[PDB]
Symmetry: C12
Subunit: 139 residues, 12 copies
């Protein structure tokens, strides 16, 4: 299993500052949202966004006080191994890119992936998130 | 396997403001309703609706033309090793100016033993909400 | 499979306002009555009834229906809504419905439906398919 | 399974029948309430116009009361344990309090059948002498 | 498949009013005595006895009932395990309210096979045990 | 198993018999009361007309009873496991009320087949054990 | 299947009054000592002792003892096992005039009360009425 | 099986009064020491000792005018774990001269029984063998 | 698994590097502290002379030129007998003079059933941090 | 297992030996007291007439006029886990000269029995072998 | 499997006083850090360092120590299940007491065979890891 | 199998008094340290050391009051059966011999041993400790 569906979106520039804010965790894996935040932040940087920062702890005023052009947020819908020995890793994530200038979602995407029996969950999550956020590469 | 049944509905415009409000969770999977909200909002956006927001009427203050609501009736793997993912959802589209349901749909799907629940859910919701694409 | 038994009933029209009221849950599956309410509301709408509304969370849902100027109330109960026990235990659904004339409280139509899926089927698929069958006489004519 | 009935009156469409508290002698929660709702729809399917379920019968001005008990309503234990239903019904004349009709029915499904299917089919068979004139 | 053993008894008529009073439950199946009570009542009625009432100690005297039907359930369960068979054991006494004497009594036991229903076995057994109380 | 009985008096149809507290030495609840109800109906089916179950020795003297049947259940269970066989063990004593002496006594045990019911085995065994007490 | 080992003993007449007293229960089986009492009491009467009572006076002998084993061994088809000791005591001087120990392992398809009833009957047979 | 080791000892006579005091229970089988007491007392009588009594320290024997005291301990008294786990018994006995408190005789015995034998049978058989030197001369 | 690194500065042997609070997003206790001590020894082995781990702005007091931080996303054996070790880590290198991330990397690895979790983590962390050699 | 013994003094029939507090380092309750009862009977069976078990702090022995004190510890006394888990026993002993407190003899013994042997039989046999140098000469 | 990685370091002399201080336990095996301390201390002695002391529970300044050996245990367990193999992971640092700098560090991991002992694997690994500190 | 590694050390005489002092237990087997102390003390005596005693309940003061020439101390790092039916006994010990006249460690050793599925834990520990302490035989 596995689909990535994304909208159109803006061309990000290297100098666009992006804050990663509170990716919700809708799974029973503790800290899956925080894992998705750390992976997503490094993905955005690896794609050429110079200045990416994860929020600590509306949230618009936090991003503006950070001089951020965009806020990347989203939700983890699935982040687990299926039950049983050799149960496969499954990942499901949604992202939204929020234009801090006007508050509107200017880009979003949903991605899911089902790994093989042999796969690691973090490998599957890291590959999927990189693919999902690929339209947000810079330059 | 599963079916989708949809009523007639209006032709949605790209500029139609849509608020996704409170998708109830009738399952024992925590947060399944919230997952359905996030997936549904992204689906409407990917279908061509520019302005979609999830509520935290409130919609009438946000100047929304339509509200999308609904309920998750099933959202789990069936029991046992290799128990297959199963999903059931209902959606309704409300005209904010008069509160009438102008479109509604029910969808269910059963995946294969190798399928991920979120993949089944995301595919089904896309199919179910497909008459709400921007024409 | 299972069985469906439906009495006779009036021909519904597109403009007949129907309120769906408190479907009782006699199973140990939480919220099964609320799931049946949602599926039933959409089915009635799929059937050509334009204005169909679910009462919010006893006889105060009846008062709500009267305040909505509903012509009929759809109520009922869920007798079964589970997978049978075990790996590959099959889904099973049992439901009863009544259509009540709001102006005088008379039951003008009622029906009972049950169904058993195979090991591979989904509970919600079975429930949705069955309620569609059971409520088919309430389609707009 | 099996069904055994007494003789009874020929009910008319207009006989107001209150379906009252069906006792649950099983460990399946609400099995009596399920039997009540199925029995009520059975009587209506059989042609009895005004059928009501108790939340008393005299305040509804019912002519007959349908009561009874559920003696069994479960799946037997284990994977593919078959459903089994046992029910007794009585029709009571409200004015004089006498039992004017009674029946007992039991049924054992096969392993792949639904409990609610077996109960619905059985209750219809048991209440068939109460179909309208 | 066990036994029924019945004593001699009086011939009952359709108009003999009969009260079924508390059937004791000596099993670990909740309400088995009440189930026996309900089945026994319908059995007597189906047997031709017109007026048969179940009690909620004199009482039957304040009911004009000619006979009291009482008893106890000794066994009412599925034996343990998958395909464990249903087993039932009952004793009944028929009491004359005009003097308190036991005028008829019977014991019955039955073991179904693995694929049978406990309620089917209880119902069939109780019909056979009370058969000498049919209206002649 | 076995059944062993002493000599005893010839019982008449007209002897008033009081069945009293049958002790339960098993971990099956109410086994003593079950044995009381089975034994009472057994004495009747054997021809004893007036036999009544007590709800001390004074109660039988209060009842104009000529004998008192008493005893104890030493075993009354299915052996453990699927197809565990029913096993029953009982002792009985018949007491003459006019002087308190034990005029008769019997012990009975039985192991039924794995496909038999405990109630059947106990009923058949009590009937055989009490058969010297027929009219 | 087990052993019975007894001392010499006196010849009991049908009129010797014998009181069966507290049979100690050294097993995990509730009431096994009481079960042994009722069985032993009936055994003595079945052997010809016309007057036997169990404690809850003026007897010539007293039967006492203890149950060392009274159970099924563990697992399905675990066999019944019984172990008992008995002492016969002349109340006139308190001396044990006869004693016996008995044990038995029944087969997997036998019941505990049968093994125990049969064993107790064999152990107490020296107390049969010889008149 | 196991082993029985006995010391030399005095020839007991029929009229020697022996009191069996308190066999210590060093096992997790409750009352195993009391079971050992009952078995040991019957064993002594079956071997020819006419007057044997079990107590309810050594002064109680003197207050019973007993010539000897049988004491001991149970080291093992169980079925080994699992279905068909075999019965195993281990006991130690000592015979004490009541006059001077000296141990005049002692013995240790152990036995592992067949999977299909009873613990009581193994224990009764072992105690009979262990105590056989105390048979009446 | 995978390893992906950004561009980064050329660390010299004399750059003081502080390793600070690697978050633990697993249910393995102390996995973050294990990553901190493995990462510190990896930086030294790569030719960086002075590496120190923070206890439980302090980097300013140490006059550190860079701060290495990160997060552990996975650090466990998969369930069952012979369940294989899985590791996932992210790192960021922070210029202390202005708080900017000047280098980041993400690494994941799935070992064989015969593999030890610490061997996988140590091997992965060495690979992930190799651009930080002298 | 193995048995290792030092040289020791030549014990006599009339030497008074007190068996004192054998430590229990196992999770088997009372394994130390069982070892004390077996050891005491082993010493008597070996020809030592006067052996007593006690109920620093050695002064109980100096009051009983004992020449030697036998002490020690149980390091292992159990069945290994599982159905047919074999009995395993490990003991250490020391013999103490009461007049000067010097350990004058010591020994260590271990034994793993067969799956079908009883723990008490293994311990009794092992302890009899370990203490056999203390038999009367 | 398993690797040992060591930096360069100073030649230790037989007379260099080394204090082993608090090896952190990052495992769920109680006392694994203390076990590593005892094994490390004996390893350094076996390598020819005369004076090696484990700190009680920069106190080494008072013990006249030239070097402090510290570190952490990242793994010290049998993998789960019957015949689960022993796995060990350790890091070490050698610290100059006079200025507090790390002058040597190393990381070792090892996975034993299913038949080997955890203490055997830890002992062999620690000896190889610390072998640069032989005198 | 396992390994034994010992440093050089002094030659002990039969008349050298040795005190065995608090062997730490770093296992989950209760009293394993006390068991190692008893085994070690008997091992030293079997090797020809006349006077050996185990400390009760700077503990150097106690040893000096016992006139001990050396103190044997150490730690138990492993003392258990591996998990499962037929799980083999495993033992790991460290020892140090302390010169009471100056507090210096003058001898130390590490031993580990993995037994067979059929062997007893106390047999394995006794054999290993005898091997480990064998340089301490009276020579």
């Amino acid at each position: 299993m596995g689909t990535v569906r994304q909208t159109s979106g803006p061309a990000l520039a290297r100098g666009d500052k992006v804050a990663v804010v509170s990716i919700a965790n809708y799974t029973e894996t503790p800290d899956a949202g925080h894992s998705a935040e750390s992976i997503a932040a490094n993905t955005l940087r690896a794609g050429g966004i110079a200045d990416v920062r994860i929020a600590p702890a509306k949230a618009m005023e936090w991003a503006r006080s950070q001089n951020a052009r965009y806020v990347l947020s989203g939700a983890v819908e699935e982040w687990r191994y299926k039950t049983g020995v050799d149960g496969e890793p499954v990942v499901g994530v949604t992202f939204e890119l929020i234009d801090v200038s006007n508050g509107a979602v200017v880009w979003s995407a949903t991605g899911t992936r089902t790994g093989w029996s042999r796969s690691g969950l973090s490998s599957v999550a890291t590959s999927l998130i990189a693919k999902v956020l690929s339209p947000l590469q810079a330059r």
